């Protein structure tokens, strides 16, 4: 069995096990700010940032046909400072081709480049979407499972507890092909769940990079914070 795992109780500036991209920044206090926070302490619009675990994950083996099961956990906070314009756009956990570069920002969360379902993306993602784009359900924010597209194969609305820390748990069981996500707000006790069938073997390449990405809006002040406090990951590939 081939296994890989990491756990950051807090983010460490300078730890090479994590690559920062775009506006992404790790504060001295240990917080990962995916989208730029201005001098005045407020989230900047037109911003996109990501972080990738430096080491690639062996998610499945073509020769043997085996597929790994995995789980990732992280705590994050989103603070929407203005009543208008609407806030945007969200953050997301993603898995895809190794050594990828940030894609289009805004509603594409830095992971996609358009709103088409393309197998060439070879990406699987769990989003926490804050702005309703033409391809989105009307309810916002919402959790969404993305398979080779920003257009979720399934979504689940949830209420944002402004500035409060949300605990997220994502798990994929290769035998049942079930990918599930759970979001918990310890502040209010609220619990949300979403799940769907996903055959990673039909989506992702054998080796992938796992990461987090966030993006703020296209017009002035259509922004919000996309801070992450901790991130753990584990994958087990049977032989």
Residues that bind a copy of itself (CB under 8 A): 73, 167, 169, 171, 173, 176, 178, 180, 182, 184, 186, 189, 191, 193, 195-197
Of 154 and 234, nearer to Mn ion (C-beta) is 154
CB atoms within 10 A of CB 72: 23
Per rule CB under 5 A, is residue 22 in the interface with Ca ion? no
Stretch that binds Mn ion, among 74-82, 114-122, 142-150, 225-233 (CB under 5 A): 142-150
Question: Residue 131: which of Mn ion, a copy of itself, Ca ion, none does it interact with, CB under 5 to 8 A by kind?
Answer: Ca ion
Per rule CB under 5 A, is residue 105 in the interface with Mn ion? no
Per rule CB under 5 A, is residue 131 in the interface with Ca ion? yes
Per rule CB under 5 A, is residue 146 in the interface with Mn ion? no
What is the helix (H) or strand (E) element at residue 78, kind and residue range?
none
Per rule CB under 5 A, is residue 227 in the interface with Mn ion? no
Compute the least distance from the CB of residue 236 to a copy of itself, in Å: 15
Q: Is-contact 53 6, C-beta < 8 A?
A: yes
Per rule CB under 5 A, is residue 75 in the interface with Ca ion? no
Strand locations in the chain (E)? 2-8, 18-22, 25-26, 32-33, 48-53, 57-58, 69-77, 89-96, 124-129, 142-147, 154-157, 165-173, 178-185, 190-197, 207-216, 227-237
Compute the least distance from the CB of residue 174 to a copy of itself, in Å: 12
Compute the least distance from the CB of residue 162 to Mn ion, in Å: 19
- Cα angle for residues 122, 126, 128 (degrees, 5° grid): 135
Question: Residue 199: which of Mn ion, Ca ion, a copy of itself, none does it interact with, CB under 5 to 8 A by kind?
Answer: none
Alpha carbons 101 and 24: distance in angstroms, whole number = 13
Per rule CB under 5 A, is residue 129 in the interface with Ca ion? yes
Of 42 and 153, nearer to Mn ion (C-beta) is 153
Alpha carbons 224 and 217: distance in angstroms, whole number = 9
Residue nearest to Mn ion (CB): 129
Entry field: residues in the chain: 239
SS (H, E, C) 28-39: CCCCEECCCECC
Binding site for Mn ion (CB under 5 A): 129, 136, 144
């Amino acid at each position: 069995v081939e296994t890989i795992s990491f756990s950051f109780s807090e983010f460490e500036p300078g730890n090479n096990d994590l690559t920062l991209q775009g506006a992404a920044i790790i504060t001295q206090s240990g917080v990962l700010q995916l989208t730029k926070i201005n001098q005045n302490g407020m989230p900047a619009w037109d911003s996109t940032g990501r972080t990738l675990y430096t080491k690639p994950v062996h998610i499945w083996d073509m020769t043997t046909g085996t597929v790994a099961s995995f789980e990732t956990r992280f705590s994050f906070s989103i603070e929407q400072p203005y009543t208008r314009p609407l806030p945007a756009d969200g953050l997301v956990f993603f898995m895809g081709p190794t050594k990828s570069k940030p894609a289009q920002g805004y509603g594409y969360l830095g992971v996609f480049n358009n709103s088409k379902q393309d197998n060439s993306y070879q990406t699987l993602a769990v989003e926490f979407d804050t702005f309703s784009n033409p391809w989105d359900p009307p309810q916002v924010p919402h959790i969404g499972i993305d398979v080779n597209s920003i257009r979720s194969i399934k979504t689940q609305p949830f209420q944002l507890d402004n500035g409060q820390v949300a605990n997220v748990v994502i798990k994929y069981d290769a035998s049942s092909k079930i990918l599930l996500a759970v979001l918990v707000y310890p502040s209010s006790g609220a619990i949300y769940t979403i799940a769907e069938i996903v055959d990673v073997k039909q989506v992702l390449p054998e080796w992938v990079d796992v990461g987090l990405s966030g993006a703020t809006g296209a017009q002035r002040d259509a922004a919000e914070t996309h801070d992450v406090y901790s991130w753990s990951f584990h994958a087990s590939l049977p032989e």
